[PDB]
Amino acid sequence: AVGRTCEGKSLDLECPEGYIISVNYANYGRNSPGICPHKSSNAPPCSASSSLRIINEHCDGRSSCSVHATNDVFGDPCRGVYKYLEVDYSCRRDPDCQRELDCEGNSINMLCPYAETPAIHICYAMYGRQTSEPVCPSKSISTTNCAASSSLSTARSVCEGRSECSIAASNDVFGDPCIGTYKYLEIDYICARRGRSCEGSSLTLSCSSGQTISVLDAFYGRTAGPEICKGNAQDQNCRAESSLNIVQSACNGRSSCSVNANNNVFGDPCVGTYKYLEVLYKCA
Amino acid sequence: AVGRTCEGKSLDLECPEGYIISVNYANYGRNSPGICPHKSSNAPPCSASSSLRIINEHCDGRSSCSVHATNDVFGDPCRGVYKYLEVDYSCRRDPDCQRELDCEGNSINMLCPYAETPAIHICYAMYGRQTSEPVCPSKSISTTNCAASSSLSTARSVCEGRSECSIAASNDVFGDPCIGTYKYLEIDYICARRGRSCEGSSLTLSCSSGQTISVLDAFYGRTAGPEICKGNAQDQNCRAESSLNIVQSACNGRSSCSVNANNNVFGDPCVGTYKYLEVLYKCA
Numbered sequence: 422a423v424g425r426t427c428e429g430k431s432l433d434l435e436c437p438e439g440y441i442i443s444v445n446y447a448n449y450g451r452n453s454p455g456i457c458p459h460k461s462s463n464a465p466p467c468s469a470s471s472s473l474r475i476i477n478e479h480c481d482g483r484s485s486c487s488v489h490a491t492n493d494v495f496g497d498p499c500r501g502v503y504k505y506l507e508v509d510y511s512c513r514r515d516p517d518c519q520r521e522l523d524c525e526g527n528s529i530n531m532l533c534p535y536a537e538t539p540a541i542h543i544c545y546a547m548y549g550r551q552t553s554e555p556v557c558p559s560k561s562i563s564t565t566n567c568a569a570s571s572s573l574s575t576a577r578s579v580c581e582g583r584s585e586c587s588i589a590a591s592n593d594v595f596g597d598p599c600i601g602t603y604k605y606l607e608i609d610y611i612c613a614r615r616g617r618s619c620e621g622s623s624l625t626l627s628c629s630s631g632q633t634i635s636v637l638d639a640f641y642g643r644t645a646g647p648e649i650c651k652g653n654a655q656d657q658n659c660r661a662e663s664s665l666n667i668v669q670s671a672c673n674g675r676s677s678c679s680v681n682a683n684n685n686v687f688g689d690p691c692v693g694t695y696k697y698l699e700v701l702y703k704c705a
Numbered sequence: 706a707v708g709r710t711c712e713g714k715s716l717d718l719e720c721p722e723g724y725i726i727s728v729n730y731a732n733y734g735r736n737s738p739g740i741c742p743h744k745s746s747n748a749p750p751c752s753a754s755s756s757l758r759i760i761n762e763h764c765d766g767r768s769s770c771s772v773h774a775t776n777d778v779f780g781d782p783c784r785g786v787y788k789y790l791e792v793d794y795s796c797r798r799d800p801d802c803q804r805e806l807d808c809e810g811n812s813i814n815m816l817c818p819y820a821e822t823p824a825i826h827i828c829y830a831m832y833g834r835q836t837s838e839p840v841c842p843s844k845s846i847s848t849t850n851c852a853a854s855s856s857l858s859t860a861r862s863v864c865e866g867r868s869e870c871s872i873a874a875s876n877d878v879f880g881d882p883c884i885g886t887y888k889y890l891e892i893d894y895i896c897a898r899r900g901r902s903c904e905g906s907s908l909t910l911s912c913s914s915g916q917t918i919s920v921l922d923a924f925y926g927r928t929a930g931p932e933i934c935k936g937n938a939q940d941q942n943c944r945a946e947s948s949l950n951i952v953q954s955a956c957n958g959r960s961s962c963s964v965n966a967n968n969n970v971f972g973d974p975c976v977g978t979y980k981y982l983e984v985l986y987k988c989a
């Protein structure tokens with residue numbers, strides 16, 4: 422996939438649910454007259470050498486990113502030349518995740534037994550059918566373009582952040598996305614590090630050994646009762662929009678970050694509930 | 706994208722024209738009961754550690770590959786267990802290629818000035834329109850799903866193997882794939898190494914410095930007159946089918962290879978024409 426934006430505007434990259442961005446090429450500069458055309462003469466090819474690393478920091482491993490195509494971000498690789506940002510990227514399932522699959526009627530049991538990586542993160546999920554043989558054969562199949570649009574959200578609502586989760590490949594969980602067709606559940610998961618701080622405090626994330634953070638899930642709000650961050654727990658469906666983007670933007674590609682769990686960073690998604698910041702991440 | 710095949714069968718991976726295979730995950734083994742099911746009890750997860758490297762050798766950088774899912778290829782990572790091969794891959798434009806673009810009416814001029822890398826290889830080509838602003842703006846646009854299906858074949862027929870090529874973004878070259886819409890030409894190209902041997906001789910390809918071969922184009926046959934491999938030149942539209950696959954299969958992922966230019970390797974694609982083997986490749 423290719424995205425292009427002119428200097429001064431922002432470029433949005435996105436992948437479908439359960440896929441992340443994998444950057445192949447990036448440049449801020451100019452290598453064609455026909456993109457963001459101005460006048461007049463052709464100049465020598467222009468490329469900011471900084472471009473790839475910056476786009477990797479801003480976008481790799483995320484489902485979504487927005488990058489400003491400006492000299493402040495990239496430097497100016499050719500003064501007096503109207504520039505543009507071009508990215509070539511692929512949307513892939515994260516190869517750091519473990520790949521599981523069971524046919525309809527079975528359950529997938531995930532377990533994160535280690536203390537340092539105790540939290541399940543669901544990377545990808547599909548309840549339905551995307552292929553025929555040799556997956557879960559049955560006489561009762563009429564489609565290979567079947568998926569609950571809810572697959573990842575439901576999987577995450579069941580399992581995200583838990584140390585153990587058993588999830589049924591069943592219509593009672595996901596709904597039935599293709600009546601009449603024998604289905605399967607395909608889930609990719611990772612055992613993540615977890616950080617949590619109560620509202621009013623800071624949260625520090627850390628990777629050792631010259632390793633770097635990739636934030637996988639984050640919310641400022643509350644999804645649990647008062648056994649987590651004792652305080653008023655009236656809204657347990659509370660999540661600041663853009664929590665993940667903010668924490669990814671603060672932390673991805675670094676060895677340490679600190680983020681304040683507070684309303685001045687995330688807004689207040691649930692007035693009168695005592696909130697916390699909970700983050701799942703990996704170190705690579 | 707995901708491909709799966711049971712032990713004893715072959716797995717075919719393919720990308721559309723101008724895209725190559727980029728492998729994300731591979732395993733020969735068993736990690737699910739529901740894929741290539743047999744009986745009965747679940748065993749511990751089974752993975753050949755060899756799998757990724759082998760699939761990379763067989764498939765990375767190619768538009769197509771076919772791999773036998775067998776113990777001879779991978780070893781046997783779990784005796785007595787019916788296995789399967791699963792690959793997760795992405796199809797991408799080769800980032801080793803230079804990215805060019807000009808609007809309809811202009812020409813793209815490619816040049817390979819160095820002796821050691823004197824041959825143009827066209828990696829990707831699209832004459833048409835795949836996006837709106839900020840590419841080649843015009844009032845006369847009614848589609849962004851327009852491409853000459855001939856784009857890459859025509860580009861290669863014009864330029865492949867030359868040290869200089871100037872190709873017009875024009876209907877007279879590619880045909881008109883979207884009448885009424887102002888078009889552009891997007892070409893990615895690389896300056897390749899070239900090897901050539903006349904039929905009856907061998908051809909050796911070589912990368913220095915612990916670098917490895919990736920074959921980009923190959924034909925056994927003839928496309929030039931008798932100034933190349935003097936001999937009968939009656940068929941100059943002569944190419945053995947599967948030349949590229951054979952040379953990729955002999956050479957990709959190695960530091961040196963030798964291939965005999967002869968009918969016992971490639972068949973005879975043009976009886977009574979004196980043939981040669983011509984290969985473009987890169988070292989990475």
Ligand SMILES: C[C@@H]1O[C@@H](O)[C@H](O)[C@H](O)[C@H]1O
Nearest residue numbers: 497499500501502503504
């Ligand atoms: C044309 C203009 O020239 C200078 O102001 C800067 O180089 C800026 O990035 C460019 O867009």
Ligand SMILES: C[C@@H]1O[C@@H](O)[C@H](O)[C@H](O)[C@H]1O
Nearest residue numbers: 561599600601602603604
């Ligand atoms: C084959 C069978 O048919 C319908 O009953 C349901 O869609 C069910 O989920 C499926 O497994």
Ligand SMILES: C[C@@H]1O[C@@H](O)[C@H](O)[C@H](O)[C@H]1O
Nearest residue numbers: 689691692693694695696
């Ligand atoms: C309990 C308390 O209630 C209000 O002051 C705010 O919503 C604050 O964020 C919360 O912590």
Ligand SMILES: C[C@@H]1O[C@@H](O)[C@H](O)[C@H](O)[C@H]1O
Nearest residue numbers: 781783784785786787788
């Ligand atoms: C079931 C059969 O068992 C042995 O013969 C081998 O391990 C073979 O790979 C497996 O498929």
Ligand SMILES: C[C@@H]1O[C@@H](O)[C@H](O)[C@H](O)[C@H]1O
Nearest residue numbers: 845883884885886887888
């Ligand atoms: C806008 C214009 O319209 C038609 O004449 C042709 O399709 C031509 O290629 C295009 O550039």
Ligand SMILES: C[C@@H]1O[C@@H](O)[C@H](O)[C@H](O)[C@H]1O
Nearest residue numbers: 973975976977978979980
């Ligand atoms: C000229 C000669 O003609 C026949 O013997 C074969 O086609 C051979 O391949 C070719 O080299």
